[PDB]
Amino acid sequence: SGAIYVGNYRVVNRHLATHNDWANLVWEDSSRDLLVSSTTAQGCDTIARCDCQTGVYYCSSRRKHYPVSFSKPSLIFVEASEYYPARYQSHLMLAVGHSEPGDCGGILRCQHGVVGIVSTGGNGLVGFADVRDLLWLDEE
Ligand SMILES: NC(=O)[C@@H]1CCC(=O)N([C@@H]2CCCc3ccccc32)C1
Ligand SMILES: [Zn+2]
């Protein structure tokens, strides 16, 4: 579990969105595993606007933050899980690292701010859903 809280937005994995998220929906994209809902309180996270390929992510299944090198956001084939059939996931970045399903939502960040959140994994790989291209998170 986990979310990004920026301005009056809450960014969560679409497969973990609550009824309150769907009832206050701003934007959702199944192919990216992302959903954004509106909040009453203002959040403290800042989104990175960069092309960094090194950062640090939070792994709840180890209670640890790990430094990682990660690939550029791309269209990657992800195997079937309990939440999605086997399909291509877009805007996904991979790194070598530990990840279990419940690790989804952990933040990946760099020197500029939040880059994305854990969305995929298994077998010593961890995949992050990028949010750096969602410029509208910084306004309205
Ligand atoms: N985004 C997707 O297509 C799904 C979302 C839910 C989900 O459990 N995953 C994978 C399954 C394999 C292990 C694993 C480890 C860590 C995190 C996520 C996963 C991918
Ligand atoms: Zn950066």
Keywords:
Protease 2A; viral protein; mainly beta; I04-1; binds zinc ion; 1 helix; seven-stranded antiparallel beta sheet; 4% helix; 140 residues
Total domain count: 2
Radius of gyration: 14 Å
Strand order of the largest sheet: 5-4-8-9-10-7-6
Helix count, DSSP H or I runs of 4 or more residues: 1
Outline: globular
DSSP strand tally:
10
Q: Termini, distance in Å?
A: 26 Å
How much of the sequence is in beta strands? over 45%
Helix content: under 10%
- Give the biggest beta sheet: 7 strands, antiparallel
What hetero molecules are in the model? Answer: ligand A1B5G, zinc ion
Question: What would you call the structural class?
Answer: mainly beta
Active site: 15 (for protease 2a activity), 33 (for protease 2a activity), 104 (for protease 2a activity)
Organism: Coxsackievirus A16 (strain G-10)
Catalytic activity: Selective cleavage of Tyr-|-Gly bond in the picornavirus polyprotein
Subunit structure: Homodimer.
